[PDB]
Design a protein around this ligand. Structure first.
Ligand SMILES: [Ca+2]
Lengths: 223, 10
């Protein structure tokens, strides 16, 4: 997260870290057994880390649980990033408490100008690289689809939206992929892609979760 | 344009 702020330990209790001997992507806990992340975050050997603040120190409140299923959307296109969503089933149910909690799925899509919370352990620099120990947070509005398409002509599908700023300085970045965009207590977005990070006129692009609520439901119920 | 992962660029 570039241009954000330290969230505070366990203030985003649905935020998870996906770990393969290092933090590689974020995700969101949606019930005791299931995590939503990005399809492009798929790999073998995923350990889900819940209740994290400092990802480099065992502080208390962590739960490390292996992924038992990693389900990429069958129509995920790695060329266009359309359908950039993945479901991870945990080996054992997480213990839910104040510091480890699920986030609600949307009942409807969000509108332009809705203010959302984007969070992660990604790069904090727009130029070069700095990775934080603790979780970072950013408040960011959903942009109009006209403005989103103007920024990225021919590249924004019905399953994507833009959020953030056009003036530069505030954005999600490398290492934040798969993590949450939460608006009015609903998981509306998944950190997906963009042109660089926090660059003028290049807002972040996010998977539009409201389009997948039925798929998520049908997939969990059958697994 | 890149994904925001440990990046996949185009
Ligand atoms: Ca920790």
């Amino acid at each position: 997260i570039v241009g954000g702020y330290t969230c505070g330990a366990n203030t985003v209790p649905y935020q998870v870290s996906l770990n393969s001997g290092y933090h590689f992507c974020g995700g969101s806990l949606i019930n005791s057994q299931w995590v939503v992340s990005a399809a492009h975050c798929y790999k073998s050997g995923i350990q889900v880390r819940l209740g994290e603040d400092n990802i480099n120190v065992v502080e208390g409140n962590e739960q490390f649980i292996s992924a038992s299923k990693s389900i990429v959307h069958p129509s995920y296109n790695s060329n266009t990033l359309n359908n950039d969503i993945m479901l991870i089933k945990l080996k054992s149910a997480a213990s839910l408490n104040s510091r480890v909690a699920s986030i609600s799925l949307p009942t409807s899509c969000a509108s332009a100008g809705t203010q959302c919370l984007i969070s992660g352990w990604g790069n904090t620099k727009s130029s070069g690289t700095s990775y934080p120990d603790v979780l970072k947070c950013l408040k960011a509005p959903i942009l109009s689809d006209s403005s989103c398409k103007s920024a990225y002509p021919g590249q924004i599908t019905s399953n994507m939206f833009c959020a953030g700023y056009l003036e530069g300085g505030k954005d999600s970045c490398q290492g934040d992929s798969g993590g949450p965009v939460v608006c009015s207590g609903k998981l509306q977005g998944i950190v997906s892609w963009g042109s660089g990070c926090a660059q003028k006129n290049k807002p972040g692009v996010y998977t539009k979760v409201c389009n997948y609520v039925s798929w998520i439901k049908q997939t969990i119920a059958s697994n | 344009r890149c994904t925001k992962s440990x990046p996949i660029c185009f």
